Design an enzyme around this catalytic site. Structure first.
Site, mmCIF file in Angstrom:
data_model
loop_
_atom_site.group_PDB
_atom_site.id
_atom_site.type_symbol
_atom_site.label_atom_id
_atom_site.label_comp_id
_atom_site.label_asym_id
_atom_site.label_seq_id
_atom_site.Cartn_x
_atom_site.Cartn_y
_atom_site.Cartn_z
ATOM 1 N N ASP A 292 0.948 -1.122 -0.003
ATOM 2 C CA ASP A 292 0.112 0.003 0.066
ATOM 3 C C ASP A 292 0.891 1.288 0.002
ATOM 4 O O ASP A 292 1.969 0.993 0.609
ATOM 5 C CB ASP A 292 -0.902 0.089 1.237
ATOM 6 N N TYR A 293 0.348 2.325 -0.507
ATOM 7 C CA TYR A 293 1.224 3.619 -0.473
ATOM 8 C C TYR A 293 0.699 4.452 0.763
ATOM 9 O O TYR A 293 1.647 4.611 1.604
ATOM 10 C CB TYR A 293 1.071 4.309 -1.809
ATOM 11 N N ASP A 294 -0.303 5.029 0.787
ATOM 12 C CA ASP A 294 -0.477 5.984 1.595
ATOM 13 C C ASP A 294 -0.624 5.459 3.036
ATOM 14 O O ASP A 294 -1.337 4.660 3.385
ATOM 15 C CB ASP A 294 -1.828 6.845 1.561
ATOM 16 N N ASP B 85 -1.985 -0.239 6.003
ATOM 17 C CA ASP B 85 -2.351 0.303 7.095
ATOM 18 C C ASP B 85 -3.707 0.674 7.650
ATOM 19 O O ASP B 85 -3.698 0.943 9.052
ATOM 20 C CB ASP B 85 -1.609 2.063 7.200
HETATM 21 MG MG LIG Z 1 -3.019 3.340 3.166
#
Ligand SMILES: [Mg+2]
Length: 265
Positions: free
Chosen positions: A25-27, A210
């Site tokens: 995942d990025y953010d 996250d």
């Molecule tokens: Mg995220």
């Protein structure tokens, strides 16, 4: 709750594995959450480039970010696999071809969803429909919650029964979307691409995210069939956080640090 990621365990399996799969995942995972602001730092980009440089590694960035965001900030790393706009746009590693997955997909399900949504819209004052290329959404922000349950049930006994589509609820919101926008689907697909021959499976999988959308990836890996010690599902968050992941890292800084350790294996 989960134990802190055993970095020695991770490093040891990384060194032993002949094929490795990374799904990031990025953010909130590779970079901190902020209130277009969350551009990747040089350190993140360099770390990803070094990881992707190893041909044993298949490295994927899985994001809801706009396609132009991933293309502009990470596209120059040709080995990275990029998934943008929640699974709607994909760029395979070492391909310069962005693929639009909606135009590959039979969207014939939309007509029946519109039919069900119109039924409830006629009976729920203030409600209305929003139509996209990919997702169909019934809004009732203006009884809503009960009607949404009735509607959910009707979609399940009809549309979902014969179309690969899933039903997602928002705060005052019922959305219907193809399964390919689900991160768990995306993760499952990435593992399945190696085939069914166990000797051709990745022997190291690191999957990081996250929030609740990432929980679907962790769940999907439980159904991968891969040897337990080969898969590391890691949530970014507190040690006390309830999660489908097996491990946690506290902060994106710890994520980047961990990848950096692997880069030096
Ligand atoms: Mg995220």
């Amino acid at each position: 709750g989960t134990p802190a990621l055993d970095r020695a365990k991770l490093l040891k399996q990384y060194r032993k594995a002949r094929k490795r799969l990374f799904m990031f995942d990025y953010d909130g995972t590779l970079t901190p959450i902020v209130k277009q602001a969350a551009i990747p730092s040089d350190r993140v980009l360099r770390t990803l480039k070094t990881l992707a440089a190893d041909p044993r590694n298949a490295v994927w960035i899985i994001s809801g970010r706009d396609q132009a965001f991933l293309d502009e900030w990470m596209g120059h790393i040709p080995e990275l696999g990029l998934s943008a706009e929640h699974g709607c746009f994909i760029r395979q590693p070492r391909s310069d071809d962005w693929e639009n997955l909606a135009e590959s997909s039979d969207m014939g399900w939309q007509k029946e969803v519109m039919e069900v949504f119109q039924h409830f819209t006629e009976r729920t004052q203030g409600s209305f429909i929003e139509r996209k290329r990919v997702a169909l959404t019934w809004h009732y922000r203006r009884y809503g919650a009960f009607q949404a349950r009735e509607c959910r049930k009707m979609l399940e006994e009809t549309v979902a029964k014969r179309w690969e589509v899933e039903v997602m609820a928002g705060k005052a919101n019922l959305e219907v979307r193809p399964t390919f926008v689900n991160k768990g689907f995306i993760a499952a697909r990435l593992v399945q691409e190696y085939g069914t021959d166990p000797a051709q499976a990745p022997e190291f999988v690191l999957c990081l995210g996250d929030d609740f959308t990432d929980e679907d990836m962790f769940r999907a890996l439980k159904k991968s069939g891969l040897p337990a010690g080969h898969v590391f599902s890691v949530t970014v968050g507190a040690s006390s956080k309830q999660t489908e992941a097996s491990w946690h890292l506290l902060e994106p800084a710890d994520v980047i640090g961990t990848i950096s350790m692997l880069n030096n294996s």
